[model samples]
Target: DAQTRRRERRAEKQAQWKAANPLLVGVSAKPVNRP
Candidate 1:
């Protein structure tokens, strides 16, 4: 219980940071070179 809640709280801040830095974040489809 404590471990899960701790992770949730940590990730919450990370999500907030990601939301604040939109320019640094981008999306990619997938890795095709592996084929």
Candidate 2:
């Protein structure tokens, strides 16, 4: 479930950022939040 964890973390981070900045909703790029 490593990949699932990674996706979950990425989603959490993205959610945090999106909550901080509402303008990131329509972006075509997904941030590379990996190690």
Candidate 3:
């Protein structure tokens, strides 16, 4: 179930990036803070 939700979120994020082409957050997304 967690995998399914993550999968959807990934797709949605990709769509947003493609639609917006905003590069400001490109590096921001790669760092995981909750580790």
Winning model by lDDT: 2
lDDT per residue, candidate 3, 1-35, as tens digits? 89888978888787776556545656545433596
Which digits, one per residue and each the tens of the lDDT, describe model 2 over residues 1-35? 89878978888887888876665677765545579
Which residue pairs in candidate 2 have backbone atoms (N, alpha carbon, C) closer than 3 angstroms, thus clashing? Answer: none
* lDDT of candidate model 2 versus the reference: 0.74
Superposed Cα deviation of residue 4, candidate 3 (Å): 12
The worst-scoring run of ten residues by lDDT in candidate 1 lies at 26-35
Instruction: State which candidate has the highest TM-score.
Output: 2
Predictions ranked by TM-score, top down?
2, 1, 3
Against the hidden reference, what TM-scores do the models get?
A: 0.38, 0.39, 0.31
Clashes of 2: 0
Better of 1 and 2 by lDDT: 2
- Candidate 3 — which residues are off by over 4 angstroms? 1-8, 22-35
Residue 29, model 1, lDDT: 26
lDDT of each: 0.66, 0.74, 0.66
Estimate, for each residue in 1-35, the C-alpha lDDT of model 1 and write its tens digit: 89878878877776777666555667642224464
Question: Which ranges in model 1 have alpha carbons more than 4 Å from their true place?
Answer: 1-9, 27-35
